[PDB]
Symmetry: C3
Subunit: 310 residues, 3 copies
């Protein structure tokens, strides 16, 4: 049976290693051979309460590539919530009477989990809830790491930049921690460090990690260098001094990288990755974004179709 059928997809913490492997296997099959009528007769809501380029466009393209239709909004200003004072709860309660699943991105932490209390039998998929979780970004990142490295175990992974507000690294560290032998290098300003709740989970599973003040000091050891943007729009006033990127990666900084190493970045970037890195063999952030199509199609098919494909 399909373990993800009709399930809410809110946090990586709720998913098992086996569930992650199932999405990846389903993504490889659909990347090889499309299923243009799999979700014919399904209508999906796409509801974005804060800005997006890749996550909204890739999700909607995936819906069309499976034959489903889409309704929704990319801003809340002209909804009833935006002009007539409606609650978020009431908005989910009526939208659940129209569609087969709801994709939602929202600026407040916990908003996706709150929507599950009001959606009845319709599954809710978290496209990002403030600085907390981003589970579909992690699905595509795992697919990408697997594709370039050949495995998801025994890897050296560095995460750089704003780790405190990075919903992308919270989800990706929790998922890489379900596999065996992975090790982490965290390179961030003291003010934007990886939160203690993530570190405590690593400690409880016996996973190695360390803190660094430069990229160059561990460059020779990493398989995946995962760069991030400072989350300007989430910063508290006590962190305004941290708005500019602290680490800036240049092509010349790649002298000592392993030949197999790849540079990833959930995007968008500001100046933390210079454009001269774009032409090197290590740049893989645009390929990573292209993999969002296969991961999000796999998640949609698993949540809305009873039977596994194959």
């Amino acid at each position: 049976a399909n373990p993800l059928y009709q399930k809410h997809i809110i946090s990586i913490n709720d998913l098992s290693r086996d569930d992650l492997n199932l999405v990846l296997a389903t993504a490889a099959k659909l990347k090889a051979n499309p299923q243009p009528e799999l979700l014919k007769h399904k209508v999906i809501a796409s509801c974005f309460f804060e800005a997006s380029t890749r996550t909204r466009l890739s999700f909607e393209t995936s819906m069309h590539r499976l034959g489903a239709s889409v309704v929704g909004f990319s801003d809340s200003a002209n909804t009833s919530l935006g002009k007539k004072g409606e609650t978020l709860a009431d908005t989910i309660s009526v939208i659940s009477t129209y569609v087969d699943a709801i994709v939602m991105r929202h600026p407040q932490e916990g908003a996706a989990r709150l929507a599950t209390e009001f959606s009845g039998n319709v599954p809710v998929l978290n496209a990002g809830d403030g600085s907390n979780q981003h589970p579909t970004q992690t699905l595509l990142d795992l697919f990408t790491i697997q594709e370039t490295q050949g495995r998801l175990d025994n890897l050296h992974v560095a995460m750089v930049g704003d780790l405190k507000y990075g919903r992308t690294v919270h989800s990706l560290t929790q998922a890489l921690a379900k596999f065996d032998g992975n090790r982490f290098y965290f390179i961030a300003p003291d003010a934007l460090a990886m939160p203690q709740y993530i570190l405590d989970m690593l400690d409880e599973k016996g996973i190695a990690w360390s803190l660094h003040s430069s990229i160059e000091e561990v460059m020779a050891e990493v398989d995946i260098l995962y760069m991030t943007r400072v989350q300007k729009e989430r910063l508290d006033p006590s962190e305004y001094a941290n708005v500019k990127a602290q680490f800036v990666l240049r092509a010349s900084d790649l002298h000592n990288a392993k030949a197999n190493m790849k540079v990833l970045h959930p995007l968008p970037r500001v100046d933390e990755i210079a454009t001269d890195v774009d032409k090197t063999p290590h740049a893989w952030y645009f390929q990573q974004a292209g993999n969002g199509i296969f991961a999000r199609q796999a998640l949609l098919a698993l949540v809305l179709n009873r039977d596994l494909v194959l």
Copy 2:
């Protein structure tokens, strides 16, 4: 047969009891047996000039469930009317060369009727025109009453809140008055009473109505309690003291309700229906909203297809 084929749907005042009943019968069949390719090859415009959550999203979902495609906008800011100075008449004249029907909501009363002067042979469906009419809200409201009450005649119905600017109750009161023996109770602030042209219509048809100062006093006799939001964005500045809801429905008010009674609301609500009512068996505003899918699929099918 099909008397609604290619008709503009602007006002309840223009439809007959038989026209209402055909839309309801068609909605019931489509709910029981869907027809996913009924409007394949159609392209419909969805043109919203003011805010919406239920009406726009339900209409677009209904079009996709019948196999049609949709184009349009949810705000006029980025159109040529919004930035290059184009008139509404010219906007309608060009969109009419592209699509098979136009769904339009607009802040000004009369704007949907105005669109029919420029759309040519393309049907215009009014999704709300200022505080005047809201005919597809009435079609889903009638479908809900009929499903919960088992009939549309000889009912006791109360309408509470902003009846002056409520496009929803103007349309619903006109449609219920086409059926026999209904009785109405209106519970509103003095500044936002039901308009005189609606009361004159009821008096001409011999339909009884009365004015009340609370929800409690009519609770034992009503079959349908229809709650409404204060239309804050339509109020005149001289009426700004009426922004907070005057009447609030709470679960304990339902203590002497009739077993069959249902609480409706076109939505969205502010505080006029407390959230403790949602769990009671009388709450039916979310089911009512879900019924917009069947009523709006039925209207689209009848206007766009020659045969029933």
Copy 3:
């Protein structure tokens, strides 16, 4: 595959007379006999960074009429470029991993050509780049001239209004100069005259053109009277005195028109065409806009389908 398969469509200056005839013949075949599954399985991006009613809505409709799906935005405010500081180049690099083609309108001249540097194998179709080019407006304008005049050669064509900033007339003059024996009349304020680079091209081909101070001077000879809007959003405030239309067309000015003459306007219009013109048989601006459906379906079919 055909000669336009997988090509970027940025400028008329890059297309041949044979490329233009191909689109026109495909447009006629699709108008006479639709192919609603032709682009089944194609997903196209529609990325508008400045306002539009006609170009975006007719392009999306054309996509649906051939079975394709569409994703995108009608403004950039809620994209990552709009709120997180993303560059336009990174925006095209990622959208090109999702779709089969990209339709783009942008306020900066040369922006569509820049996008072809980052889109890899994905075709970019320019829906307007500042005051520079507008190649799909020219394709529907050619289609319209052919349908009403029976040909695209031996015509007298007058272009009135803002010729300096009108992207429409830069593209159309370049295209009509690829056919035979046409003669042009340019009627514009001196501050907004046809640019020199266009006039030099005509001279190099031996094409006859002249400048006129009134519409009455050439009314008796024209086959096509192409009216234009002053491009307010492109002017410098020092040129603000030219905002009001210098030339207003009225139904009374058509008394000595040829019986075949048609008045065209890419739209929207502000004050340059009075509404009394609309009911004359010479008015053809709404019919021209309807022809964007056939011209845009044809171009999408040739760019995305290998066979004919």
